[PDB]
Amino acid sequence: SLKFENTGLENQTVELSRLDDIMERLGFVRAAQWDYERVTYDRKYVVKEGTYYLRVQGYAIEGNVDSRYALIKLLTPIMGKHYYPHDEHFPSSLVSQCQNVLAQVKSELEKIKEE
């Protein structure tokens, strides 16, 4: 339920193949692949209490999810939390790390924006 506002990600669109390359490079794997409207990427931070995951998601505004060419509009990134083995408190260090990763997501998208 933690969100990251003001990353700039929601303000520009990107081709899916170009998004995919960027995400894999930055440690994300595809997630929630049952959804045909949205593409989802998770970067996992496993800890003693379980798994935190930085989730970046976008919808196909043009084309579709199963196509090489699809135009993706990104939504507000979130950090999810899963407890294993069994009001959420989010660790400030992990918040800072996720902020850093999102900054490089944004920087990589800015580098190809005009092409």
Q: How far is CA 115 from CA 14, 15, 71, 91, 112, in A?
A: 10, 10, 14, 38, 5
Distance CA 60, CA 101 (A): 23
User: CB-based burial of residue 38 (10 Å sphere; 0-12 exposed, 13-18 middle, 19+ buried)?
Assistant: middle
As beta bridge partners, residue 54 has 43, 79
Cited resolution, angstroms: 2.0
Fold of 1-115: TATA-Binding Protein (3.30.310)
Per-residue b or e along 70-93, where b marks 16 or more CB atoms closer than 10 Å to that residue's CB: bbbebbebebebeeeeeeeeeeee
